[PDB]
Design a protein around this ligand. Structure first.
Ligand SMILES: */C(=C\C(=O)N1CCC[C@]1(C)C#Cc1cnccc1[C@H]1NC2=C(C(=O)NCC2)[C@@H]1Nc1cccc(Cl)c1OC)CN(C)C
Ligand code: NA
Ligand code: NA
Length: 308
């Protein structure tokens, strides 16, 4: 049962903007729950004003909060100020798209494959809750630590009813370059169209944050996919890794891998990481980990109106 803890704005202090974009505005803050002594670092999201959209996101997140999952962003509550704001635990390393672009020189094969495992685990949990995310992308994965990522942004997410296998969309803006062909052509979304987006997300990580189909207009994408063209092989990917991406982008949705299968295959690759990704100076790379004594030192348009 979806519940919402309303947190008083007086319980938040030191609110400062972190960034803005198509997602709206996100701030960081310190939440001091009433009758408690602990100051909790939080992230706070609003849209650029409308209140229906942000409450729909709150409902979806609350609906999948029990039992929850380590690789899925949890809603702490909402706040009612001049606008409605969503509250979550601050992810101090930011989004995974920025992280891979900024730390390319220290991202080894073990990190990339573990992120693939973790996103597939979070997505498998969401599929088990009948949730179709509809906006899986590297920009919507957050970094709690370099070793632990979480799926975020439930702005397009839809819950499927007991007797429903797909969601049919109306004319809202959607991320064409992350979408399955059937979603671009017929506005149909399923757990298997989220698998297509998962393949694009994996390609974004393996290219250290390249823009997919860069310089190609979104209106040409369905014709390119119908001709059999796909995103290119990233140079660090051995053939078995690229073949996972190509299976995610199959025309037949039911033939694409399942999230449960992707957890197993990427977990196998993470057991011998240098066999599956070839990265120069891989064994000499290191990213901060909570087990490191000095870990505390580290803590100091994509969306368019559909044409078909
Ligand atoms: C990503 C950049 C990015 O996200 N950045 C860069 C500067 C900091 C900021 C805005 C952030 C963040 C962040 C940190 N801790 C927790 C959550 C968030 C947050 N970021 C984004 C979220 C999202 O929903 N959409 C995309 C960006 C996200 N989620 C939040 C924030 C507050 C409350 C809730 Cl409940 C919540 O999740 C629903 C790359 N850019 C291209 C987007
Ligand atoms: Na949004
Ligand atoms: Na299959």
């Amino acid at each position: 049962q979806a519940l919402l803890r309303i947190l008083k704005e007086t319980e938040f202090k030191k609110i400062k903007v972190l960034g803005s974009g198509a997602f709206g505005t996100v701030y960081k803050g310190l939440w001091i729950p009433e009758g408690e002594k602990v100051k909790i670092p939080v992230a706070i999201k609003e849209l650029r004003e409308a209140n229906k959209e942000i409450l729909d996101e709150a409902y979806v997140m609350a609906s999948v909060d029990n039992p929850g999952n380590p690789h899925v962003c949890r809603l702490l509550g909402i706040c009612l100020t001049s606008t409605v704001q969503l509250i979550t635990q601050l992810m101090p390393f930011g989004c995974l798209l920025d992280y891979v672009r900024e730390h390319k020189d220290n991202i080894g094969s073990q990190y990339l494959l573990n992120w693939c495992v973790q996103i597939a685990k979070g997505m498998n949990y969401l599929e088990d809750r009948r949730l179709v995310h509809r906006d899986l992308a590297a920009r919507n994965v957050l970094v709690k630590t370099p070793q632990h990522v979480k799926i975020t942004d439930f702005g397009l997410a839809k819950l499927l009813g007991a007797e429903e296998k797909e969601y049919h969309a109306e004319g809202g803006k959607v991320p064409i370059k992350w979408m399955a062909l059937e979603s671009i052509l017929h506005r149909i979304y399923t757990h298997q169209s989220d698998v297509w987006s998962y393949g694009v997300t994996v390609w974004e990580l393996m290219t250290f944050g390249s823009k997919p189909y860069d310089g190609i207009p979104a209106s040409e994408i369905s014709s390119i996919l119908e001709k059999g063209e796909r995103l290119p092989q990233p140079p660090i990917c051995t053939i078995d890794v690229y073949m996972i991406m190509r299976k995610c982008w199959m025309i037949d949705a039911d033939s694409r891998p399942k999230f449960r299968e992707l957890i197993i295959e990427f977990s196998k690759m993470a057991r011998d990481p240098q066999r599956y990704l070839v990265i120069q100076g891989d064994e000499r790379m290191h990213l901060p980990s909570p087990t490191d004594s000095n870990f505390y030192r580290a803590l100091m348009d994509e969306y368019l109106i559909p044409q078909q």
